[PDB]
Amino acid sequence: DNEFLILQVNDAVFPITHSFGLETYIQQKKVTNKESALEYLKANLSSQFLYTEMLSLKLTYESALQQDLKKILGVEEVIMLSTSPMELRLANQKLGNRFIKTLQAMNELDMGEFFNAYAQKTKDPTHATSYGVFAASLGIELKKALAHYLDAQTSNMVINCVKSVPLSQNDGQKILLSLQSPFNQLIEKTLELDESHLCTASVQNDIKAMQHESLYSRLYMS
Amino acid sequence: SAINHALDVADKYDVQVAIHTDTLNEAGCVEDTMAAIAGRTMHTFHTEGAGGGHAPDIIKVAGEHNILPASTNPTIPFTVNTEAEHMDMLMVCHHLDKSIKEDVQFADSRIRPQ
């Protein structure tokens, strides 16, 4: 059903390489063990994921419910012009393009006239905004869509951390299981956030993302 | 040191001592100035501070017994134009050239409409 299609498109897009600065943290020896990785993940989810991805997802969901294509495009432009790190900007653009292409090609079903028009008129679609507008057009619940997106992104983050630190699958499962309460807290925060906090400037995360370009050997795209 | 010596000599010779305190807090704050005064009769100019670094804490000395506080013309009464002329007056009085970056940076005021 809807959950099956969400899982299918998520698997076809995201698993089918992006570190978002985690590689830089590991190379600079700031993330070493389970507790350090958990602290990094909590901080990243609290600042950058919350104020750049979840907030943008909620804003795009509201704008698509109101059928505000101009508002969606303005939000995308704000995100693009606020994303200072080149690696982060390129990763977001690539993920959004991949999501749009997968929806256009693999999903042989009536996604929606609004979504089709948005895809045909957009220029730099972020992955979070694309998922938000897709959920809004499909009628998915806002809280459920946010929970699913956050869970998928955190699963990718924990598997990347377990591959790169490296950790054990036991530690990966532990950090996946121990983040349930922060997930609910982040969803509750997004439930009361607003557009004024969109793309709140993270400092150390952006610095590490930009230093990822100057890293000696890059095992991750961004 | 100068405050202490002047107050000693003035107590010897029965003459008043007036003070215009250190604006830069170079040697100490209002507490250090009051400790140097050491509860001896002192007549203070610009007890409101007049934008000095002792401001606004130097107003505290106006409650001490040994301090006779005086206030200057320009800041009374408080009007709409009072704050506009203060920096020019301060720079010209303290002999800081307005064409010098160092002197302009030095000319720092802690004056407030409050």
């Binding site: - | 040191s1 100068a2 202490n4 830069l24 807090n25 170079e26 040697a27 100490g28 704050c29 250090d32 670094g53 009464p77 009007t79 709409v80 134009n81 009072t82 506009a84 002329e85 020019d88 007056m89 010209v92 307005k98 064409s99 160092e102 940076q105 030095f106 720092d108 802690r110």
Partner: protein, 238 residues
């Protein structure tokens, strides 16, 4: 109409400004005196009118004279025109800075400087000290203040700085903002090296024997960063 000497002086200034204005209308390029008088008289009249504030008058004084209305060199000579004007809320000092744009043709008293830097405190080696302002107010230290005896709210290794002063242009100052940490360069105090005054921590010749007394005094008086031994041996005079 009891007239004060200040009022008589202002009347003379106003009519000098009127003469300058009449000459400007005739088309004579104003000289230094005429330009200053014109600006001052205009500011006084506007303040008497009372529709403008001192800030508005400071802005407006810079628009009275164009560079082509004055003789060559007048704009260079006039740096600022101050005038005490009686507003509806009392007498205020209106200062107009650079009221006329310089043409650049003739600069009276202009300097022709060499293109070579001045080396100050030549032959004196400077040491570097890290200073933190742990107080709540900014602190300015002059070029010749004995750095050992600065505000006790500044935190640094005072032992390193005994007998030294800031290595900056004389008459300039270094500002330490609260909480801010800066690195400063210090050079030995010259001459007889007799430190008198300041915070009365030395009050004598600055040498290694007076250094211990100064450090003990600073520790007793609570100067930050002053480290003196717990078992301090007093001298006959200290």
């Amino acid at each position: 109409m009891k007239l004060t000497p200040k009022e008589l002086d202002k009347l003379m200034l106003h009519y000098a400004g009127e003469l300058a204005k009449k000459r400007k209308e005739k088309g004579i390029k104003l000289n230094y005196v005429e330009a200053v008088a014109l600006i001052s008289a205009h500011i006084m009249e506007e303040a008497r009118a009372g529709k403008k504030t001192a800030a508005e008058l400071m802005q407006e004084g810079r628009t009275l004279l164009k560079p082509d209305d004055v003789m060559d060199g007048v704009a260079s000579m006039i740096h600022e025109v101050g005038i005490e004007a009686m507003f509806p809320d009392g007498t205020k000092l209106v200062t107009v800075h650079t009221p006329i744009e310089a043409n650049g043709k003739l600069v009276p008293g202009e300097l022709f400087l060499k293109n070579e830097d001045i080396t100050i405190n030549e032959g004196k080696k400077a040491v570097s000290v890290k200073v933190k302002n742990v107080g709540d107010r900014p602190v300015q230290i002059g070029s010749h203040f004995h750095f050992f005896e600065v505000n006790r709210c500044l935190d640094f290794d005072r032992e390193k700085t005994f007998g030294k002063r800031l290595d900056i242009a004389s008459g300039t100052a270094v500002r330490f903002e609260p909480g801010e940490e800066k690195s400063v360069e210090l050079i030995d105090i010259g001459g007889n090296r007799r430190i008198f005054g300041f915070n009365a921590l030395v009050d004598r010749q600055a040498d290694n024997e007076s250094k211990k007394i100064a450090l003990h005094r600073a520790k007793e008086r609570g100067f930050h960063g002053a480290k003196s031994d717990d078992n301090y041996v007093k001298t006959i005079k200290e």
